[PDB]
From Swiss-Prot, chain A:
Domain of life per record: Eukaryota
Function comment: Component of the 26S proteasome, a multiprotein complex involved in the ATP-dependent degradation of ubiquitinated proteins. This complex plays a key role in the maintenance of protein homeostasis by removing misfolded or damaged proteins, which could impair cellular functions, and by removing proteins whose functions are no longer required. Therefore, the proteasome participates in numerous cellular processes, including cell cycle progression, apoptosis, or DNA damage repair.
Modified residue annotations for N6-acetyllysine: 4
Subunit field text: Component of the 19S proteasome regulatory particle complex. The 26S proteasome consists of a 20S core particle (CP) and two 19S regulatory subunits (RP). The regulatory particle is made of a lid composed of 9 subunits, a base containing 6 ATPases including PSMC6 and few additional components. Interacts with PAAF1.
Protein name from the UniProt record: 26S proteasome regulatory subunit 10B
Stated family: Belongs to the AAA ATPase family.
Residues of the full protein shown: 69 to 122 of 389
Compartmental location: Cytoplasm; Nucleus
Swiss-Prot record, chain B:
Residue window of the full protein shown: 39 to 93 of 418
Summary of subunit composition and partner proteins: Component of the 19S proteasome regulatory particle complex. The 26S proteasome consists of a 20S core particle (CP) and two 19S regulatory subunits (RP). The regulatory particle is made of a lid composed of 9 subunits, a base containing 6 ATPases including PSMC4 and few additional components. Interacts with NR1I3. Interacts with PAAF1. Interacts with TRIM5. Interacts with ZFAND1.
Family according to the record: Belongs to the AAA ATPase family.
Its biological purpose: Component of the 26S proteasome, a multiprotein complex involved in the ATP-dependent degradation of ubiquitinated proteins. This complex plays a key role in the maintenance of protein homeostasis by removing misfolded or damaged proteins, which could impair cellular functions, and by removing proteins whose functions are no longer required. Therefore, the proteasome participates in numerous cellular processes, including cell cycle progression, apoptosis, or DNA damage repair.
Cellular localisation: Cytoplasm; Nucleus
Taxonomic superkingdom: Eukaryota
Lineage: Eukaryota, Metazoa, Chordata, Craniata, Vertebrata
Protein name as annotated: 26S proteasome regulatory subunit 6B
Species of origin: Homo sapiens (Human)
């Protein structure tokens, strides 16, 4: 999975075990491993604070 | 000397053939080592592949 840190450089790593690559495609928000940067958990996208304000 | 020179022709061909043999088992050994190398070529790597760019 060719990635870039949302606030850093770019890398290519894999998922943990069962993050369900089925729905996981370029664009969805994921988490990364502390050690190997590997994907540990994907999660829903942001909510952009101002939306909660409205 | 037919009972010396001719006979002396084997005084070294034995070690000759022994080393000609050993070259085969050492082909085997070096093949083992080359397979080890090819193994170690790409086993730690390609998992945390960071991305830059050629310049």
């Amino acid at each position: 999975f060719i990635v870039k840190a949302t606030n850093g450089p770019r890398y290519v790593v894999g998922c943990r075990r069962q993050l369900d690559k089925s729905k996981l495609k370029p664009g969805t928000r994921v988490a990364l491993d502390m050690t190997t940067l590997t994907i540990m958990r994907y999660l829903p996208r942001e909510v952009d604070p101002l939306v909660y304000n409205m | 000397d037919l009972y010396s020179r001719y006979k002396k022709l084997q005084q070294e061909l034995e070690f000759l053939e022994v080393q000609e043999e050993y070259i085969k088992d050492e082909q085997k050994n070096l093949k083992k080592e080359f397979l080890h190398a090819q193994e170690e070529v790409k086993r730690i790597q390609s998992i945390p592949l960071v991305i830059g760019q050629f310049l």
